[PDB]
Each structure stands twice: as structure tokens, then as C-alpha cells.
Automatic annotation (TrEMBL), chain A:
Protein name listed in UniProt: Propionyl-CoA carboxylase complex B subunit
Gene: pccB
Signal peptide interval: none
Similarity section: Belongs to the AccD/PCCB family.
Highest taxon listed in the record's lineage: Bacteria
Residues of the full protein shown: 10 to 177 of 530
Coiled coil: none
Ranges that cross the membrane: none
TrEMBL record, chains C, D:
Highest classification ranks of the organism: Bacteria, Bacillati, Actinomycetota, Actinomycetes, Kitasatosporales
Source organism: Streptomyces coelicolor
Family as reported in the entry's similarity comment: Belongs to the AccD/PCCB family.
Whole-protein coverage range: 355 to 530 of 530
Protein name as annotated: Propionyl-CoA carboxylase complex B subunit
Length: 168, 353, 176, 176
């Protein structure tokens, strides 16, 4: 049903499936054609098997500018979470090029900030996997605010927790 | 044994007080005096016996059947705490098996279909703790909220959980104070806190207001907001209004906030909401005043009475299958154990009293 | 009410002056059942924790636990003054004689009471004052009521440089 | 040049006032090849690290990354003021319309451009100002240019007691 508990669990399983496949099949194809891997494939290569715990998987943007609200993909264009690399704690974010060309948005940015706050809070490295066309223009200045917030964390975490940038 | 006069204030200041049924008593003023001053006739047992202080006054934390069990209870209490605030609680590390068990699965069906039928939060707690062992404190006081100790992977953790079986899990003055002190106790001694949420709001009542719920209920929010130990929150079902804020919400500083598919995170009940949002829309056309409202209500609950809007905003880090609660808590505590945070410098806070 | 206030003053470095005239705690089943044990303890905790200057003046009654509660020297008060009219004792004379002289009074129902009232009057004349407390230094001085202002002013001058702190901790666990 | 200066002021507790009118970074293959990515980052690092009072006034252009770089609130600036003439946006209108309206413009080669120039003119009239940034609080206020001195003076009075510090570390790892 839906109004039943079982129905709600099935509803979750449906959303999970939509979230893990946020990008269109065609977008994924082009990504692979360019000899590039997907955001989730990269995280799986980095983290120890089964250690990945995704954060903000169902995040969605709040913009209505230039018809952007027509499409609100789960995760909003970046896969984030934590796990282990060789048994040691690591926080990670992986930009998804198949979603809006990976253009950095407001929620997209907040997700990376959460990953960074988490790493600073628990004292673990942050591995950022980059693959983005640029700022999500439709969001105007909100896009720049997200950048600024990230820049500040980068500076404050400088020399405190290791920060590695994987630009693919 | 007896604890009379100003003597009672010493145990009051200590962290946990354990009494014995019908063989221990605490009271500031004796029956004799209250009688000649108030004309009230009360026996020692009714005035300040173990049962009275364990379920009515909120002062004692446990009522044992005999001294032998009472001593055993403190030993247990000590087993969950560090020798002092300089170290983490004692642990006997043992890696857990994270594969889904038949027990984990049970969780997927623990929440009934009707938003009203209650379920025992004790089961939820046991399913996440090692050997399903949950050491409860203050069982007889404010039964609407549960507090206690357990272990995850051999490491001590504290627990705070609304109990749908009593007052439908609503918070009130007593539950707020019971939980507030426990959270602060765990935090002072570096014990992580796991909270399970199913709260429809605060118990309504003139008495609640007059008795000072505004300042007494604030105690719980202050406790969570002040805490620097790891905090993981799981919303199993209801979480409305301020109550949602109070129960270890991310806004207070919780590190990991999980919500089951059955969670309902909203400002207020659907009916109470639609009555305000659609006051005029329903006002018009007295013709069929109600199926339309029952429709507006149905629509409001189908659209907002779930955890997805909170998820969109990151208020909850994840919406998970109930059967995966143990895994999230286990893997969450592993990362969170190195958490280091501090409050602004001060001699001390000014928590509401 | 007083507990929250004392903690407020202390948190913001405001010295606290306290005046005592308390016979004890209000009797009543309601007081116990509503949690006077844990709610009353909040005042002793507030005073024991405070590090700002503390000056206490007992004008009159200071009995039992209440005496301890009202910023007594035992809690950490820096200067404790008492007027000649102060009565610092474990409990009221009547309550005290009933325990101390329960036997000598039980003797001879004849003349039970005037001897009772006699002992009460004797007890209060011997212990219902501040002098035993002054002997042990519990009060720093017994003063003429009119010298209260001079003592407060001069005490505050010396006490303003007070520096003290509690053992390190994230925070305390005050009764709630 | 600015980065070293900001760090100098900060190290010696000197407040920094910054005025913004920047359209972006100087285009050029040389800029990239000589390391603008790591050398430009030095300014954001300097501003994000600074703990002295920071007051920023955008007089005009504030586009893209440059806006972030020039002591934006996102980096930690305490007070961000903007004149009515300020234009705070992701990029210039032309560059923005070419991306946003690439399709609607491609349509009808007939009248390709005036519609193009139309959208550009519309975009700048809607977003090339400080009001969207003011809506989100990115700027604390939009002020009359003549009130700049009053805001600076009163802001500096409140900000002089500013106390902030970065996470403990031997030192940072600023781009070199």
C-alpha cells in the first residue's frame, strides 16, 4: 500500500534506486565514453569494501530560477559520506558530472561542507573527488556562497587534517 | 536506611541514588513536624520511602528488592562509567558482525500500520545493544521516556528514548528533567548518547504550564546542546514541533541523525496544520465543509508527514531501513569516537532551574 | 529562584551578599513529593560552585540544613558575619530538648512539662545564639547590626581580587 | 601583494578594510601557466585565516570567484556593505545568458541577436545588483555611498573586541 509500514519501506527502496541512478543513462554513457568513471564508482575504488556510509543521499535543491525546479535529482549532484581506507577513517565527497554537468549548487555545496565539518570534528582526512563544469549559473550568487564556505573550511582545516584533491 | 534533614542534600548532589524497598527513607522534614504544622498524617513509607522517591519525587534512580540486589546495581552502574572524567568509559572491544540477522529484520515490522497502535521502544533499544542488554535507570519515574546504559561493540553508551506505551511518548515536565540530568551525566563522563525518537509533542495541561514546563522542559534542550560526546539520533516515528527540536536534533549538535521510513517530521499534526493553512479555503462553501478538509488533511499528511523534507535539507543524514539501525550506530560510533568539540570558555553555564 | 540567581551572578563575576533569617524548610507532604530533596539541593550547589566574592550576614535564625544552604562558610563563603540576635543551631530548642532529654523528661509525669519548658528555655539560652559558631570560626565575627555596612564595604574591597576555580571538568551535574 | 599584506595586518592585530570593484581574473595563458590557481588562492587563504576585524564595501563589480576572494562574508568578513551600484553575480550578464539561454537563442536565426542583447539587458536589470546577495544576508546592508564612513566608524567600534581563533595547529599550509 503506502499507508502501511511495509508500503513505506517499499517506498524507501524505490527512492534509493532513483537516488543511486540520479544521472540519466545517456549522461552515464558519455561519462564512460570519455574514459571517466562515475562518482559512485570512484568512491567504491577508494573506500574499503562495505565501509561507505552515504550522507544526504536524498538531498534536493531549493532553486526555482530559470525552471531549475523542474528537475530536483536526489543527492543534488555530489555523492558524500565517510568510510575507511586501509582500515583508517576518511571522509569523502565525489562530484557527479552526469547531474547538471556537475555544476556546484547551494545544497550541493552544503553537502561538501557537512563532509568537511565531519572530518574536522572527528579528525580524519578529507578526500575530494572533483569533476564539475563549474558554478550552477541558475542559482546565481547562492553558488558563490557555497564556494566561499568551502574555501573557509579548506583554510581552517589547513595543516589540521590531511586534505587530498582527486581531480578527474 | 534513613536519610533525614539536611543530610538528604548530599545524595541529591551525587550522580545516582539507589534505594531499597521498604527499608530506606529520605526526607527533609519528619512526619511529626509536618503533622503539627500542616495537620497532615503521613507514614514514613508514604512520605519518603523507596517507591515514593523512585516514581513520585524523581530523586532516586532505582528501587531494589533487597540490599544484595542494590549493591549489585551500583556495581553495574560503575561498570558503564570511567574512573574519572579524564578517560573514556571502560571497554572490552569486540568487533560486531554487521551482516543482517533475523533479529535485525524484525525491526522492519516493529512499527504497526496505525499511527496510534503503540509498540515497545524497549525492543528497539535491545536490538541495537550488545547481547540485547539494556540497563535502565529510573524505570518507575516518567515512564514516557526511557533512560539507561548498554554497550555497542563492548563500549558503553547511554540511551534516551520516548516510550509510545506511556502517554503515547509525549514529553512533559518529569520526562524532560529525568532525561536532561541523564544526558548531562553521560556527557560529563564521556559516555556517548543514543536517542530514539517517537514524540507527538508535549503533554497538554494547565498544570504543565503552571508548574513551569517552559523552564523545566528547556533543561533537555540545554543538555543536548551542551553535550560534546558523540550523539546519534534515530527517529522511528513521530517528531512534531519543538519536541522534534528537543530530542537530539541536528540543530542542537547531534552528529548523526537517522530516520526510519515511518518517521513523521513536521511542525504539527496534519489536522492542526490544515485548520490554519486552509482556514479560508474550507470556510468557503459550507456546502460539504468536511470531506474537503478530510481531503486537505489527507493530502497534508501524504505530502508532509514523513522524513523526506527533513532529508532534503540534511536535517537527517539518512532515511534507512529499520533493519539497518544497528549497522549505522555501530559504524557511526567507530568514526565518532574521536570527536573533539568544546563550548565557549566560561566558569559554567546558566541552565534553567 | 535563588539558585538560578546565584549562578547568574557568579557566571558574570557579580559578588553575592546574603542575609540569613531562616528557621528551616517549609513542612509539607507536597514539598517532598514534588522533589524538595533535589530541587532544594540546587541552592547549596550554586553556592559551593560560586567563585565570586561571598559575604553572608546572619541576622537571626539559622537552623539545620538551611543554615548550611544560606551561603555558609562550609560551602565556601569568604566572610560570615552574625548579629547578636543570630541563633545558629542544629534545630529549634523544643525539637532539640525532646531528643536530648527524652528520658529525664519521661521521668516523673508529675511535673512533666514545666521541666520540659525549663530545659527548652535553658537550651535556647545556652545554644540559640552565634557564639558556639563563633568559637569554631564558622562565622568570622559577631557584629553590632549597625556595623554591617562597614564590614560589607571593607570586606568587598579585600575580596574583589579573589581568585579561585573548581576542578577541571566539561561542566558539573547540578541536580535537575 | 594583497595576500602578504592581509597576513601582515592580521599577525599584528590591524583591522582590514576592503573595497571591492572587481570583474574577475585577468585572462591569459600566462596567468594559468605561471600558477594563478595556487598563487591566487593565497588571498582567499589570507582572508579566511584572519581574525582581526574585517569590513568589506562593494562599490561596484563583484563577479564569480573574485567576489569570494575579496573578503566576502563567506570567508569570515564581519560586516559586508554594498553600494546601490554594486553588481554581485556569478558572472557577467553576457556570459551568463549564453549559458542560460543557449537554446532559446539558437532558435530562429532570424532575430538571433537583438533577443540575445535583450536577454542580456534583462539579466543585468534583474541580477546585476546587490539585492539578491542582500536577501541571503551575504551583504549585511545596502548603503548610500555617503554613509560609508559612518558604517566603517560604528562597525569598527563594535568589532574591536572581536575574539576568534582557528583550530589548533603548528601552522597552516598556505599555497606556495
Amino acid at each position: 500500500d503506502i499507508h502501511t509500514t511495509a508500503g513505506k519501506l517499499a517506498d524507501l527502496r524505490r527512492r534509493i534506486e532513483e537516488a543511486t541512478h540520479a544521472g540519466s543513462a545517456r549522461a552515464v554513457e558519455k561519462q564512460h565514453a570519455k574514459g571517466k568513471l562515475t562518482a559512485r564508482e570512484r568512491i567504491d575504488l577508494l573506500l574499503d569494501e562495505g565501509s561507505f556510509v552515504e550522507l544526504d543521499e536524498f538531498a534536493r535543491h531549493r532553486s526555482t530560477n530559470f525552471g531549475l525546479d523542474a528537475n530536483r535529482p536526489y543527492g543534488d549532484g555530489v555523492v558524500t559520506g565517510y568510510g575507511t581506507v586501509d582500515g583508517r577513517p576518511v571522509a569523502v565527497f565525489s562530484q557527479d558530472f552526469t547531474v547538471f554537468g556537475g555544476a556546484l549548487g547551494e545544497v550541493y555545496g552544503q553537502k561538501i561542507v557537512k563532509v568537511m565539518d565531519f572530518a574536522l570534528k572527528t579528525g580524519c582526512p578529507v578526500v575530494g573527488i572533483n569533476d564539475s563544469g563549474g558554478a550552477r549559473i541558475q542559482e546565481g550568487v547562492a553558488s558563490l556562497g557555497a564556494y566561499g564556505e568551502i574555501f573557509r573550511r579548506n583554510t581552517h582545516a589547513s595543516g589540521v587534517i590531511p586534505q587530498i584533491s582527486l581531480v578527474v | 536506611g534513613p536519610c533525614a534533614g539536611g543530610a538528604v542534600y548530599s545524595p541529591a548532589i551525587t550522580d545516582f541514588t539507589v534505594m531499597v524497598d521498604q527499608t530506606s527513607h529520605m526526607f527533609i522534614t519528619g512526619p511529626d513536624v509536618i503533622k503539627t504544622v500542616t495537620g497532615e498524617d503521613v507514614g514514613f513509607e508514604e512520605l519518603g520511602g523507596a517507591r515514593t522517591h523512585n516514581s513520585t519525587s524523581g530523586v532516586a534512580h532505582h528501587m531494589a528488592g533487597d540490599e544484595k540486589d542494590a549493591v549489585e546495581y551500583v556495581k553495574q552502574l560503575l561498570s558503564y562509567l570511567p574512573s574519572n572524567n579524564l578517560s573514556e568509559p571502560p571497554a572490552f572491544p569486540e568487533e560486531a558482525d554487521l551482516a543482517v540477522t533475523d533479529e535485525d529484520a524484525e525491526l522492519d515490522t516493529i512499527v504497526p500500520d496505525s499511527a496510534n497502535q503503540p509498540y515497545d521502544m524497549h525492543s528497539v533499544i535491545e536490538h541495537v545493544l550488545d547481547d540485547a542488554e539494556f540497563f535502565e535507570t529510573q524505570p518507575l519515574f516518567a515512564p514516557n521516556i526511557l533512560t539507561g546504559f548498554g554497550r555497542v561493540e563492548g563500549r558503553p553508551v547511554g540511551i534516551v528514548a520516548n516510550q509510545p506505551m506511556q502517554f503515547a511518548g509525549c514529553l512533559d515536565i518529569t520526562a524532560s528533567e529525568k532525561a536532561a540530568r541523564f544526558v548531562r551525566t553521560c556527557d560529563a563522563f564521556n559516555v556517548p548518547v543514543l536517542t530514539f525518537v517517537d514524540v507527538p509533542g508535549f503533554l497538554p495541561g494547565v498544570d504543565q504550564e503552571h508548574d513551569g514546563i517552559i523552564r523545566r522542559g528547556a533543561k533537555l534542550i540545554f543538555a543536548y546542546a551542551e553535550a560534546t560526546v558523540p550523539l546519534i539520533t534515530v527517529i522511528t516515528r513521530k517528531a512534531f514541533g519543538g519536541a522534534y527540536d528537543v530530542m537530539g536534533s541536528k540543530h542542537l549538535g547531534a552528529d548523526l541523525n537517522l530516520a526510519w521510513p515511518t518517521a513523521q517530521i513536521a511542525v504539527m499534526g496534519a489536522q492542526g496544520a490544515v485548520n490554519i493553512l486552509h482556514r479560508r479555503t474550507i470556510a468557503d462553501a459550507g456546502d460539504d465543509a468536511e470531506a474537503t478538509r478530510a481531503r486537505l488533511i489527507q493530502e497534508y499528511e501524504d505530502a508532509l508527514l514523513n522524513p523526506y523534507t527533513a532529508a532534503e535539507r540534511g536535517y537527517v543524514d539518512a532515511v534507512i531501513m529499520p533493519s539497518d539501525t544497528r549497522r549505522h550506530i555501530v559504524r557511526g560510533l567507530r568514526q565518532l569516537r574521536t570527536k573533539r568539540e568544546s563550548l565557549p570558555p566560561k566558569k559554567h553555564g546558566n541552565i534553567p532551574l
